[PDB]
């Protein structure tokens, strides 16, 4: 096949101008989409706060209007999903991944409204859910929609505009362009065969997405954490140990989301009214915990600079980790619309901080800042649970600009994915696709 | 396919422990190797410096001892490549690329000593070439060497260990662990068919490689440029224009490297003595340039911060850019062992800084710093000529740490890789692998 390859080599990277232009408009719309979705989630959480002040005297009334305001919004999003778009429950990444294997449909006429307005429901109630799931599936479908509109043919185009959509989608959720592109290249593309996902075109989509985000967001970065200390060579072995800790917990967490998916399906069996009611209970519990124990609820982007700085006690870190594991499972395993990615950064940090804390007290000769161990462990549930270590390392890198920590971030990351592999664990997004293709068959 | 897929998903990212443990040995070896390559080169540039001290009075004599010292060292490397391993000429990234498509041999028992010691000659005489060619080829060969020694069977084991070695080698040359992983993913894996390269094992080898770099180098990074200003959004269109300029020049420079590869071959006809004699005059010229005007010679990493801080006049920059476009084509089209990746970084930094200075005077309302256009231009030739923009960006990112410039950098990058596609350029590493398979069926 020598002569064949000489031909292909000379034809490499010649994406059709049609796809390059269209990836631009996908990026842009996904950008405006995520920006709108981001503004809307905020506005709801705010109206929720100003309610607790029209009533801030009667504390039992206070705990009540906190619960019902989230419950109602939870339910509204659960309902929007079962009634009109069931594959828009949960993250949506496993679907958009299925769409790339050509095994799941991109029902964009249903999912765009269902995910967007249904996500605003669950996120806006203050449930423990990220915006990544929403934006990524929303972005994916937006790619499909502009395909079907301009009726472009080829595999290249269907897969590209699907990729650049969900890529631009993740980018716009975190202001993380590099992280989006890598997410397609490492995690989303079809993993057992070749593909015609133009990477140059995913690049154009991500650009536009990210520019649109800079137009409605500037002067504030999602997280500021400032410059932390370096790490000496003789400290690296501590980050490897922290990777191993993630590597055994990573898979353990994966078992729980699945068994909790099962456990919560026993609660409604499929019944849209038991389900929506159950979601409202979950919602209201989060909005209640949102008032009374805020670090145990919400997406988690907030307490990440607090937890780097070392402002929490060790007892608090232990509390938050247990409590947030529990609400993370309740919210994500329930099937409410919304990703798990962003709350796994939170669980990661908290754990890394707690470790840096013990590490600082054991080794004063090392001159540690517990904040470095938190940054290494932020991308570490991503490594050990969804097994996209290159994505999380660069995602964290983009969010925290502490490049002098690249070696320990990497080292904790592979430690995580190595022990996650070796203790018998599977990628989370992949093992959700499969259970969903194995119900898309066991019914026959 | 649904039954097939479901079964494959439940089995994903289960790289055999044998491969992973062997990836760790590959990275360790390449880091040590690459460190050693780096220390050697400097030691020889040092000797050439202190030898100009013992002859620092006779200005004609001085010019001659610099010419000869490098001329001699040049020839030693041209010889070591023609006599014992021809596929160790030039970069060797095309070579490792062919090897991953199963279309070229990894003659490691021949190439390791040739590329290592031949590289020491051309680099150490201060020729316009980068340790990256040498280190990526050495790394891949080191990855084949442990595959053989330990008799690991399989297409996966052969493709992975060959890859993590070449990533380990780019990392070690630039202290760029991500930029190494991304090189394999974006440019060096088989580009048109699926492959069983294990990313988790490339990562492991790059860690070990880079850890070696930090044990013998730390508290010093290759380039330090400071923290530059941010990029207002009403400034970004200026960065699309730069990538367009880089996007048209990229292919023209690609022609010139392909074309002059041809023209220097007519000089020696293929003959090892005219060739080694030609290389000594190139490498002799370089070590001479390196005294009467050091910015027209060398790998070029030197003048990237000197350019970014606008410490050059507009004239000097125009010079340095044309002079270095010359001495880059002479050194690399000549067959001399050594990468083009670093001398391209220095070309784009020079181009960008010049562009920055024009902007600063046309638009005082934008409060510009020319240094931010250097950092977007640094990796723009990489984007426009070898057409690995992701790897390029993330490389310069890991080398300059001005992450606030990620958007202008990403934009000049696509600005180049788009206009390079639309003016009919090619991935120069794939264009060389092509012209080398075209002679292998004729």
């Amino acid at each position, epitope marked *: 096949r020598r002569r064949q390859l000489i031909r292909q080599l000379l034809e490499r990277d010649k994406t059709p101008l049609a796809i390059l232009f269209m990836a631009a408009v996908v990026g842009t719309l996904v950008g405006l989409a995520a920006v709108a979705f981001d503004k809307g989630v905020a506005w709801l959480q705010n109206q929720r706060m100003g309610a607790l002040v029209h009533t801030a005297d009667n504390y039992p009334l206070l705990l009540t209007v906190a619960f019902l305001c989230s419950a109602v919004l939870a339910m509204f999003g659960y309902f929007l999903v079962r009634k009109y778009a069931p594959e828009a429950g949960g993250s949506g990444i496993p679907e958009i991944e299925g769409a790339l294997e050509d095994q799941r449909p991109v029902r964009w006429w249903r999912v765009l409204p269902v995910k967007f307005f249904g996500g605003l429901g669950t996120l806006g109630g203050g449930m423990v859910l990220g915006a990544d799931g929403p934006t990524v599936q929303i972005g994916g479908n937006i790619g499909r929609m502009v395909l079907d509109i301009f009726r472009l043919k080829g595999d290249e185009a269907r897969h590209t505009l699907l990729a650049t959509g969900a890529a631009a989608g993740l980018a716009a959720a975190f202001n993380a362009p590099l992280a989006g592109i890598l997410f397609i290249i490492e995690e989303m593309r079809p993993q057992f065969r070749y593909t015609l996902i133009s990477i140059k075109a995913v690049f154009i989509g991500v650009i536009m997405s990210t520019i649109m985000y800079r137009i409605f967001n500037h002067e504030v970065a999602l997280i500021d954490v400032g410059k932390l*200390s370096d790490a000496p060579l003789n*400290t690296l072995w501590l980050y490897l140990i922290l990777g191993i800790i993630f590597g055994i917990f990573g898979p353990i967490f994966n078992k729980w989301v699945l068994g909790m998916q099962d456990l919560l399906h026993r609660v409604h069996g499929g019944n849209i009214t038991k389900w929506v009611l159950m979601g409202g209970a979950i919602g209201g519990l989060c909005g209640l915990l949102g008032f009374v124990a805020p670090a145990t609820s919400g997406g988690g982007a907030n307490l990440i600079p607090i937890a780097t700085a070392g402002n929490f006690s060790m007892g608090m870190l232990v509390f938050i980790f247990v409590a947030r594991v529990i609400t993370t499972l309740l919210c994500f395993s329930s099937g409410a619309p919304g990703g798990i990615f962003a709350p796994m950064l939170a669980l990661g940090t908290v754990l890394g901080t707690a470790f840096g804390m013990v590490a600082v007290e054991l080794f004063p*000769q090392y*001159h540690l800042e517990a904040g470095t161990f938190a940054i290494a462990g932020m991308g570490a549930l991503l490594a050990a649970s969804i097994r996209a270590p290159l994505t999380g390392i660069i995602l964290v890198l983009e969010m925290t600009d502490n490049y002098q920590l690249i070696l320990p971030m990497i080292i904790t990351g592979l430690g995580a994915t190595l022990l996650a592999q070796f203790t018998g664990g599977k990628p989370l997004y992949s093992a959700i696709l499969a259970r969903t293709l194995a119900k898309q068959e066991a019914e026959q | 396919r649904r039954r097939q897929l479901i079964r494959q998903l439940l089995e994903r990212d289960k790289t055999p422990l044998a491969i992973l443990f062997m990836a760790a040995v590959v990275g360790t070896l390449v880091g040590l190797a690459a460190v050693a390559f780096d220390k050697g080169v400097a030691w020889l540039q040092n000797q050439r410096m202190g030898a100009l001290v013992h002859t620092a009075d006779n200005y004609p004599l001085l010019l001659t001892v610099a010419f000869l010292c490098s001329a001699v060292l040049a020839m030693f490397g041209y010889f070591l490549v023609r006599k014992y391993a021809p596929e160790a000429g030039g970069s060797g990234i095309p070579e490792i690329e062919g090897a991953l498509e199963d279309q070229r041999p990894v003659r490691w028992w021949r190439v390791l000593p040739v590329k290592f010691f031949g590289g020491l000659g051309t680099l150490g005489g201060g020729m316009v070439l980068g340790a990256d060619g040498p280190t990526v080829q050495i790394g891949g060969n080191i990855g084949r060497m442990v595959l053989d020694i330990f008799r690991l069977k399989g297409d996966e084991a052969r493709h992975t260990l060959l890859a993590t070695g070449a990533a380990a080698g780019l990392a070690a040359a630039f202290n760029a662990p991500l930029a190494g992983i991304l090189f394999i993913i974006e440019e060096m894996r088989p580009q048109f068919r699926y492959t069983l390269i294990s990313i988790k094992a490339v990562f492991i080898g790059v860690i070990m490689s880079t850890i070696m770099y930090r*044990i013998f180098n*730390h508290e010093v990074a290759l380039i330090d440029v400071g923290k530059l200003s941010d990029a207002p959004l009403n400034t970004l269109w200026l960065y699309l224009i730069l990538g367009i300029i880089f996007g048209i020049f990229g292919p023209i420079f690609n022609k010139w490297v392909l074309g002059m590869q041809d023209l220097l071959h007519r000089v020696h006809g293929g003959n090892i003595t005219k060739w080694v004699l030609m290389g000594g005059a190139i490498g002799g010229l370089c070590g001479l340039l390196g005294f009467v005007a050091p910015a027209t010679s060398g790998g070029g990493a030197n003048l990237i911060p000197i350019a970014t801080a606008g410490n050059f006049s507009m004239g000097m920059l125009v010079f340095i850019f044309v002079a270095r476009v010359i001495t880059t084509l002479l050194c690399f089209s000549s067959g001399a062992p050594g990468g083009i990746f670093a001398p391209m970084l220095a070309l784009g930094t020079v181009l960008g800084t010049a562009f920055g200075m024009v902007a600063v005077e046309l638009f005082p309302q934008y409060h510009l710093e020319a240094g931010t256009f250097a950092i977007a231009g640094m990796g723009a030739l990489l984007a426009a000529s070898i057409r690995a923009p992701l790897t390029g960006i993330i490389l310069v990112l890991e080398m300059t740490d001005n992450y606030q410039l990620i958007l202008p950098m990403i934009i000049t990058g696509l600005g180049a890789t788009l206009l390079a596609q639309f003016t009919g350029g090619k991935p120069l590493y794939s264009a060389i692998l092509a012209r080398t398979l075209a002679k292998q069926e004729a």
Partner: antibody
Framework: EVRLLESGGGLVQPGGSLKLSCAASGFDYSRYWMSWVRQAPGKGLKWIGEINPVSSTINYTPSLKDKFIISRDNAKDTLYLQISKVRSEDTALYYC??????????????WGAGTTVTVSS | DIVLTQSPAIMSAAPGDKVTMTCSAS?????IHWYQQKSGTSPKRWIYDTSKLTSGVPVRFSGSGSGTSYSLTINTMEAEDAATYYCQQWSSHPQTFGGGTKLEILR
């Protein structure tokens, strides 16, 4: 240049107190741990204590409770050492150093000229 | 805590001549540092991490060792080499110096 200029040591009466000041000039005085070391006359170097840049951790040698109080004032670019309940054992030349590391086994990077504390009645 | 004892407490040696002091620790120690003090001058960092010279330290100086025994060595001694050499560890906390070694010109 990198200059560490410590002042403030003179004569104190036994059981009194003093506040040595080390003024820093020529480097970003944050990002650096600062440390105090004293030398008793005709004796060797003894480590007093150290302070990390955000003052979130101050380590002192095995010695008493409010004996030493290291603070720093990162804005004035100055390091401080209060000694209370001063004995003759505290009669020593007091050194102020900036801390760094290589492989990460921490060392005393740049020292100052010193000041002398005499404790006599 | 770790006790460092530098061995030839005082010593002389002619110039153009080899000199060798010793640091010896009660427990094991990793990567020792060495300072050079002249009277009335700040201690100068001389040698860190068992072996590494500092920016300016002439090449005649060198260090070696492992575990519980290190050393400092001047291959050819100059006149400017008379000073006190303090070894210092921080492999363990808290850190500790040696007694010193006073190097005087012999004449």
């Amino acid at each position: 240049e990198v200059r560490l200029l410590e002042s403030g040591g003179g004569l104190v009466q036994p059981g009194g107190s003093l506040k040595l000041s080390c003024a820093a000039s020529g480097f970003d005085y944050s990002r650096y741990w600062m440390s105090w070391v004293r030398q008793a006359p005709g004796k060797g170097l003894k480590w007093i204590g150290e302070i990390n840049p955000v003052s979130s951790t101050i380590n002192y040698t095995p010695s008493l409770k409010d004996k030493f109080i290291i603070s720093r004032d990162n804005a004035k670019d100055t390091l401080y050492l209060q000694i209370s309940k001063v004995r003759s054992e505290d009669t020593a030349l007091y050194y102020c150093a900036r801390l760094y590391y290589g492989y990460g086994y921490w060392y005393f990077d740049v020292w100052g000229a010193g000041t002398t504390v005499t404790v006599s009645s | 805590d770790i006790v460092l004892t530098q061995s030839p407490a005082i010593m002389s040696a002619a110039p153009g001549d080899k000199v060798t002091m010793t640091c010896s620790a009660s427990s094991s120690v990793s990567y020792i540092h060495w300072y050079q003090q002249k009277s009335g001058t700040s201690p100068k960092r001389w040698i860190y991490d068992t072996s590494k010279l500092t920016s300016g330290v002439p090449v005649r100086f060198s260090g070696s060792g492992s575990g519980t025994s290190y050393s400092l060595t001047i291959n050819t001694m100059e006149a400017e080499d008379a000073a006190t050499y303090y070894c210092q560890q921080w492999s363990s906390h808290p850190q500790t110096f040696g007694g010193g070694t006073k190097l005087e010109i012999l004449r």
